[PDB]
């Protein structure tokens, strides 16, 4: 979330205060002094932290404190983060290691204000969270450096800084650089290679790749195919984007930049005609195997509608992303928290992915496979619950109430009006319920004649196994 | 059981006049005058009142309003033996009556327990010699004729012969239990078409003229209004008195148009103080309009994170939020260029302070799914 940030701040008081700050931007209610539960500390410290914060807010911010509680008000949000984050040594150190491969230790001790042994002690802590990304900061009396494969260095920064894509402390004058990414998207969206993408994710990649290129930290050590078709199609417009920062991309950098862009592509996409035809013409082997797979999944769950969903196009794109570079696609999984009947049939997906590529721990991939499958199946499944509806009282109001309830319960809950006589029903499944206003064996949800706010909370709650 | 109140209801439920000493001692005069004048403040809400003399205890006002009050009082108690001695036996009689209707070409959907409870009360009141009078009705009315034989047979099962006014009133209790958005059997439908086609023609002009006055014709408004007009024209007096039952509902939940409705109404029946009719009519319009508005709020959806997750989550949010809510995926770009209305929210997990944002966690908790439902409530109710 900001949780990468949280793992990398080594100063606890400052982390605490960062957690306080987010609290009062995130929740524009009044928060109670009692909030201290949410931050997990004493109210005492909350009050000391607030005063700490107050003493250094820019003029147009304020924190107002009373009986009604605590609240942050302003007469833009990242100006607060730009004030507080650089107060942390570990963030200062990561900011400098993003822009140069190596720092002079004495010169960083000088600007941070700390002793070598103290920095050693912070860097030990930081190295515990970098461990997962396959990185470590080495500290000598001469040099401070970020050791690890350049691809993994960039993925870590991307995870860490994507939320700060509009922050001037990390990306000096970001808006001018983002305008370059916007211009590249316009050209893409206005051509027949148009493709939908996550633009903040894209733009932050553009920023990171530019900065590492200017600091002479180049990527390598991954397989790709120089002659890959999608790569060749997009290479020109990616060359122009990076050209706008005075970057020329050598062979490896150029594929990396393209891979980063590809990772930003959405599912259920709308592809321009040149992209479409390239995907129909140059990936017809993968496609056909996935077609077979989707027909066999549909057959095995007993609903041929599946074949008319986007599952085929989504799975193709998933496989493309993985077979473009297994080294990279694997390493890119670190951007996120890697958190039965499909999983059996997914052994066929797993064997198809041997046929084009090799992969080691496919758990993340299978889980994306599953999300796409599950998604497809839910787009076509009918209703997964029957809200049985027994209502005695004024007929006009029953009919209106019935209609409001069905609409509000959404398109997966069937609301069926029944009579007492008919309720001798062995049509009940672990999921189903009866809604009633009449006292009445069974699981019954009682509604007031005019449903209360409480009744409707609990009612939505009990639909939840039918939705996520 | 020790509610002296109840206890007085019951004797007057099952007995017209009381000897007051009988109650005075059958229970435990001045004390009773106290309980009655407090009772009497609710009674007034039904145009009822209890009267005490030394001689008798007596519920003054129309037998009709008494029975309506009892009905609001007991539809919940319909499967209770304290009020309805062996309800099981009696309800069985109501079920056979429905079958002789439901099997047959007179079928109509109704609220069966509201119906059963009317049958029980009308039985009780007739056997205790409290007759209704004091309304207007046509004995040769075709819907009444149609249902009279099956109703006569329902009451015959309790040993009752329906004396004329009691006949129509039992028919009306039944008619009042009929649902809207109904489906009618062949003989009922044919009656409807043969005796109300002109009225249907006039409500159809009305629905059109109302649909341009602000696409309603896709709704079921027409037939539901026909049914309203059918209930009402059977007895405006009884129609208005039965509104006493749900006073609560209506007094909190298109007025000029409805003058045409009244003028139409006036060609078939009297329209003296047609307050309820006007509230019912408004509630049908409301539901008809409701089903045809489509989207009343927009939830803009800003997501960054794993694209597979984006697509699943967008789908499931959209379904959960329902059809009256537009889930629109936007990029950060368009946030500044949103022209955004009262109801609208921004759902997100990328982070400007003062905005109608609802922050979602990459797997939303039951808890934040509760809150989200809440934000939609003014678009659904």
CATH of the domain at B51: 1.10.10.10
Alpha carbon B90 to its chain's center: 24
Q: Which of residues 168 through 207 in chain B touch A, CB cutoff 8 A? A: 176-181
Q: Do B224 and A399 touch (CB under 8 A)?
A: yes
Q: Which residues contact B198 (CB under 8 A, 6 or more apart)?
A: none
Residues of A in contact with B358 (CB under 8 A): none
Decide: A230 and A274 in contact? Cβ < 8 Å.
no
Of chain A, the end-to-end C-alpha distance in Å amounts to 20
Q: Do A408 and B322 touch (CB under 8 A)?
A: yes
| Helices B258-266 & B186-213 angle (0-180, nearest 10) | 140
Of B76, B324, B350, Cβ closest to residue A163: B350
Alpha carbon B261 to its chain's center: 20
Residues of A in contact with B305 (CB under 8 A): 336
Q: Could you tell me if B76 and B153 lie in one domain?
A: yes
Q: Nearest-CA neighbor of A384 among A298, A277, A263, A466?
A: A466
Q: Nearest-CA neighbor of A85 among A168, A178, A156, A157?
A: A168
Pairing state of beta strands B357-359 and B345-348?
Answer: parallel
Q: Could you tell me if A175 and A310 lie in one domain?
A: no
Residues of B in contact with A408 (CB under 8 A): 322, 324, 373, 376-377, 380-381
Residues of B in contact with A450 (CB under 8 A): 249, 253
The Cα–Cα gap between B298 and B267 comes to 45
H/E element holding A413? strand A413-417
| Helices A341-352 & A363-378 angle (0-180, nearest 10) | 120
In chain A, what's the furthest Cα-to-Cα distance?
87
Q: Could you tell me if B171 and B191 lie in one domain?
A: no
Q: What's the gap in Å between the CA of B200 and the closest CA on chain A?
A: 19
Where does a domain end: A148, A181, A209?
Answer: A148
Q: Could you tell me if A378 and A403 lie in one domain?
A: no
DSSP of A155-214: HHHHHHHGGGTT-TTTSTTHHHHHHHHHHHHHHHHTTTT---B-HHHHHHHHHHHHHHHH
Q: Do B315 and A379 touch (CB under 8 A)?
A: yes
The Cα–Cα gap between A247 and A239 comes to 8
Q: Do A410 and B179 touch (CB under 8 A)?
A: no
Decide: A325 and A255 in contact? Cβ < 8 Å.
yes
Of B113, B320, B353, Cβ closest to residue A420: B113
Q: Could you tell me if B267 and B348 lie in one domain?
A: no
Total CB pairs under 8 A between chain A and B: 186
The two structure tokens encoding residue A5: 């940030």
User: Nearest residue on chain A to B359, judged by CA atoms?
Assistant: A26
| Helices B307-321 & A311-324 angle (0-180, nearest 10) | 160
Residue recorded with tokens 């808006």 = A175
Q: Could you tell me if B212 and B258 lie in one domain?
A: yes
The Cα–Cα gap between B17 and B266 comes to 40
Between the CA of residue B82 and those of B52, B78, B114, what are the distances in Å?
A: 26, 10, 18
Residue B210: other Cβ atoms inside 10 A: 22
The two structure tokens encoding residue A341: 């009947």
Query: Does A270 touch chain B if contact means CB atoms closer than 8 Å?
Result: no
Residue A427: other Cβ atoms inside 10 A: 8
H/E element holding A446? strand A444-446
Domain that holds residue B85: 62-179
H/E element holding A130? helix A116-130
Strand, helix or coil at A255? Answer: helix
Of B224, B249, B324, Cβ closest to residue A397: B249
The CATH number covering residue B335 comes to 3.40.50.2300
In chain B, what's the furthest Cα-to-Cα distance?
85
Q: Which residues contact A205 (CB under 8 A, 6 or more apart)?
A: A158, A257, A260, A261, A264
Q: Among positive and negative, which fits the CA dihedral A26, A30, A33, A34?
A: negative
Q: Could you tell me if A247 and A299 lie in one domain?
A: no
User: Nearest residue on chain A to B329, judged by CA atoms?
Assistant: A198
Instruction: Render the burial of A414-424: b for 16+ CB within 10 Å, e for the rest.
Output: bbbbbbbeeee
Q: Which of residues 282 through 311 in chain A touch B, CB cutoff 8 A? A: none
Decide: A84 and A22 in contact? Cβ < 8 Å.
no
Q: What's the gap in Å between the CA of B32 and the closest CA on chain A?
A: 32
Decide: B264 and B203 in contact? Cβ < 8 Å.
yes
Of chain B, the end-to-end C-alpha distance in Å amounts to 39
Q: For A27-115, where are the alpha helices, taking DSSP H only?
A: 36-39, 43-54, 78-84, 89-99, 105-112
Q: Do B319 and A467 touch (CB under 8 A)?
A: yes
Q: In chain B, how many domains are there? A: 4
Residues of B in contact with A394 (CB under 8 A): 245-246, 249
Disruptive mutation site among B108, B231, B312 for chain A (greatest number of A CBs within 10 Å): B312
Q: What's the gap in Å between the CA of A48 and the closest CA on chain B?
A: 23
Strand, helix or coil at A340? Answer: coil
Where does a domain end: A266, A293, A310?
Answer: A266
The two structure tokens encoding residue A194: 């148009």
The Cα–Cα gap between A68 and A82 comes to 29
Q: Nearest-CA neighbor of A152 among A279, A396, A335, A305?
A: A335
Classify residue A8 by burial, with Cβ atoms within 10 Å: 0-12, 13-18, 19+: buried
Strand, helix or coil at A435? Answer: strand
Q: Nearest-CA neighbor of A219 among A152, A170, A281, A171?
A: A152
Calculate ∠ Cα B93-B96-B97, nearest 5°: 85
The Cα–Cα gap between B20 and B30 comes to 12
Q: Which of residues 368 through 397 in chain A touch B, CB cutoff 8 A? A: 368, 371-372, 374-375, 378-379, 391-397
Residue recorded with tokens 């005796």 = B195
Residue recorded with tokens 């069905």 = A406
Deposited experimental method:
X-ray
Calculate ∠ Cα B147-B151-B156, nearest 5°: 150
Q: Could you tell me if A271 and A258 lie in one domain?
A: no
Instruction: Render the burial of B294-329: b for 16+ CB within 10 Å, e for the rest.
Output: eeebbbbbbbbbbbbbbbbbbbbbbbbbbebbbbeb
Residue recorded with tokens 């007739």 = B126
Residues of B in contact with A391 (CB under 8 A): 111
Resolution, in Å, please?
A: 2.3
Decide: B110 and B179 in contact? Cβ < 8 Å.
yes
Q: Do A449 and B333 touch (CB under 8 A)?
A: no
Q: What's the gap in Å between the CA of A267 and the closest CA on chain B?
A: 6
Strand, helix or coil at A61? Answer: strand
Q: For A55-104, where are the alpha helices, taking DSSP H only?
A: 78-84, 89-99
Decide: B292 and B218 in contact? Cβ < 8 Å.
yes
DSSP of A266-326: PSS----HHHHHHHHHSSHHHHHHHHHHHHHHHHHHT-GGGGGSTHHHHHHHHHHHHHH-H
Residues of B in contact with A373 (CB under 8 A): none
Strand, helix or coil at A97? Answer: helix
User: Nearest residue on chain A to B242, judged by CA atoms?
Assistant: A394
Q: What's the gap in Å between the CA of B369 and the closest CA on chain A?
A: 8
Q: Which residues contact B378 (CB under 8 A, 6 or more apart)?
A: B343
Q: Which of residues 201 through 230 in chain A touch B, CB cutoff 8 A? A: 201
Q: Nearest-CA neighbor of A193 among A261, A278, A257, A320?
A: A278
Residues of A in contact with B98 (CB under 8 A): 421
Q: How many residues does chain B have?
A: 381
The two structure tokens encoding residue A44: 């005492």
Instruction: Render the burial of A64-88: b for 16+ CB within 10 Å, e for the rest.
Output: eeeeeebbbebeebbebbbbbbeeb
Q: Which residues contact A408 (CB under 8 A, 6 or more apart)?
A: A456, A460, B322, B324, B373, B376, B377, B380, B381
The Cα–Cα gap between B276 and B253 comes to 13
Residue recorded with tokens 């309790």 = B158
Q: What's the gap in Å between the CA of B97 and the closest CA on chain A?
A: 13
The Cα–Cα gap between A92 and A435 comes to 59
DSSP state of A468: -
User: Nearest residue on chain B to A78, judged by CA atoms?
Assistant: B352
Q: Do B322 and A407 touch (CB under 8 A)?
A: yes
Q: Do A368 and B249 touch (CB under 8 A)?
A: no
H/E element holding A63? strand A61-66
Q: How many residues does chain A have?
A: 468
Of B112, B306, B377, Cβ closest to residue A419: B112
Q: What's the gap in Å between the CA of A163 and the closest CA on chain B?
A: 7
Between the CA of residue A450 and those of A415, B158, B278, B321, B371, what are the distances in Å?
A: 17, 36, 20, 21, 20
Q: Could you tell me if B175 and B98 lie in one domain?
A: yes
Decide: A53 and A21 in contact? Cβ < 8 Å.
yes
The two structure tokens encoding residue A220: 């390598």
Residues of A in contact with B111 (CB under 8 A): 391-393, 395, 398, 419
Residues of B in contact with A264 (CB under 8 A): 307
Classify residue B189 by burial, with Cβ atoms within 10 Å: 0-12, 13-18, 19+: middle
Q: Could you tell me if A100 and A232 lie in one domain?
A: no
Name all contacts of B373-376 with Cβ < 8 Å and 24+ positions apart: B373/A408, B373/A456, B373/A457, B373/A460, B373/B320, B374/A453, B374/A457, B375/B345, B376/A408, B376/B297, B376/B321, B376/B322, B376/B324, B376/B325
H/E element holding A138? strand A136-139
In DSSP terms, A417 is beta-bridged to: A389
Q: Nearest-CA neighbor of B177 among B104, B119, B248, B244?
A: B119
Q: Could you tell me if B135 and B190 lie in one domain?
A: no
Q: Which residues contact B205 (CB under 8 A, 6 or more apart)?
A: none
Q: What is the 3 state secondary structure string of chain B?
A: CCCHHHHHHHHHHHCCEEEHHHHHHHHCCHHHHHHHHHHHHHHHCCCCEEEECCCEEEEECCHHHHHHHHHHHHHHHHHCCCCCCCHHHHHHHHHHHHHHHHCCCCCCCECHHHHHHHHHHHHHHHHCCCCCCCCCCCCCCHHHHHHHHHHHHHHHCCCCCCCCHHHHHHHHHHHHCECCCCCCCHHHHHHHHHHHHHHHHHHHHHHHHHHHHCCHHHCCHHHHHHHHHHHHHHCHHHHHHHHHHHHHHHHCCCCCCHHHHHHHHHCCCCCCCCHHHHHHHHHHHHHHHHCCCCCCEEEEEECCCCHHHHHHHHHHHHHHHCCCEEEEECCHHHHCCCCCCCCCEEEECCCCCCCCEEECCCCCCHHHHHHHHHHHHHHHC
Instruction: Render the burial of A272-301: b for 16+ CB within 10 Å, e for the rest.
Output: beebeebbeeebeebbebbeebbeebbeee
The CATH number covering residue B105 comes to 1.10.1790.40
Q: What's the gap in Å between the CA of B356 and the closest CA on chain A?
A: 9
Q: Which of residues 14 through 73 in chain B touch A, CB cutoff 8 A? A: none
Q: Nearest-CA neighbor of A178 among A162, A194, A196, A190?
A: A162
Instruction: Render the burial of A221-241: b for 16+ CB within 10 Å, e for the rest.
Output: ebebeeebebbeebbeebeeb
Residues of A in contact with B108 (CB under 8 A): none
Instruction: Render the burial of B58-70: b for 16+ CB within 10 Å, e for the rest.
Output: ebebbbbbbbbbb
User: Nearest residue on chain A to B351, judged by CA atoms?
Assistant: A163
Classify residue A461 by burial, with Cβ atoms within 10 Å: 0-12, 13-18, 19+: middle
Q: What's the gap in Å between the CA of A118 and the closest CA on chain B?
A: 33
Q: Nearest-CA neighbor of A339 among B362, B301, B366?
A: B362
Calculate ∠ Cα B60-B64-B70, nearest 5°: 85
Q: Among positive and negative, which fits the CA dihedral A321, A325, A330, A336?
A: negative
Q: Could you tell me if B298 and B356 lie in one domain?
A: yes
Classify residue B126 by burial, with Cβ atoms within 10 Å: 0-12, 13-18, 19+: buried
Alpha carbon B148 to its chain's center: 24
Where does a domain end: A110, A130, A148?
Answer: A148
Query: Does A454 touch chain B if contact means CB atoms closer than 8 Å?
Result: no
């Amino acid at each position: 979330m900001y949780s990468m940030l949280k793992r990398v701040i080594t100063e606890k008081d400052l982390l605490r205060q960062i957690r306080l700050l987010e609290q009062l931007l995130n929740v524009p209610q009044l928060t109670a002094k009692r909030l201290a539960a949410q931050i997990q500390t004493t109210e005492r410290t909350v009050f000391s932290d607030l005063q700490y914060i107050r003493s250094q807010l820019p003029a147009d911010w304020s924190i107002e404190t009373d009986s009604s509680g605590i609240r942050l008000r302003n007469q833009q949000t990242n100006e607060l983060w730009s004030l507080f984050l650089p107060q942390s040594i570990s963030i200062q150190l990561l900011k400098e290691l993003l822009f140069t491969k190596e720092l002079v230790t004495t010169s960083f001790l000088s600007t941070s204000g700390v002793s070598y042994e103290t920095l050693k002690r912070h860097i030990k802590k930081m190295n515990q969270a970098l461990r997962d990304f396959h990185l470590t900061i080495q500290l000598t009396t001469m040099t401070i450096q970020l050791i690890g494969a350049e691809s993994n260095i960039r993925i870590f920064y991307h995870r860490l800084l994507v939320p700060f894509t509009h922050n001037n402390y990390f990306f000096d004058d970001y808006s001018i650089h983002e305008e370059h990414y916007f211009q590249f998207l316009k050209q893409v969206y206005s051509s027949e290679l148009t493709v939908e993408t996550e633009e903040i994710f894209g733009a932050c990649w553009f920023f990171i790749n530019t900065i590492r290129n200017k600091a002479n930290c180049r990527v390598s050590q991954f397989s790709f195919d120089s002659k890959d078709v999608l790569f060749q199609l997009y290479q020109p417009s990616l060359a122009k984007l990076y050209a706008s920062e005075g970057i020329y991309l050598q062979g490896e950098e150029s594929f990396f930049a393209f891979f980063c862009f590809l990772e930003s592509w959405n599912y259920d996409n709308v592809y321009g005609e040149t992209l479409a035809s390239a995907l129909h013409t140059h990936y017809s082997q993968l496609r056909k195997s996935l077609q077979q797979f989707v027909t066999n999944l549909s057959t095995e769950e007993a609903r041929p509608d599946l074949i008319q969903t986007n599952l085929l196009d989504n799975l193709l794109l998933l496989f493309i992303k993985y077979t473009e570079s297994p080294t990279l696609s694997e390493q890119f999984q670190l951007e996120y928290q890697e958190l039965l009947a499909l999983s059996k049939s997914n052994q066929e997906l797993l064997e198809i992915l041997s046929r084009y590529t090799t992969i080691e721990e496919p758990t993340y991939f299978l889980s994306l496979a599953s999300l796409l499958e599950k998604q497809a199946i839910y787009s076509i499944q009918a209703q997964t619950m029957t809200a049985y509806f027994l209502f005695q009282g004024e007929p006009a109001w029953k009919a209106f109430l019935q209609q409001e309830l069905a609409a509000y319960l959404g398109t997966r809950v069937k609301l069926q009006a029944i009579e007492y006589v008919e309720l001798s029903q062995l049509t009940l499944n672990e999921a189903d319920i009866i809604i009633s206003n009449f006292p009445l064996d069974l699981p019954v949800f009682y509604l007031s004649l005019i449903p209360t706010k409480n009744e409707l909370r609990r009612l939505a709650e009990l639909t939840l196994h039918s939705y996520f």
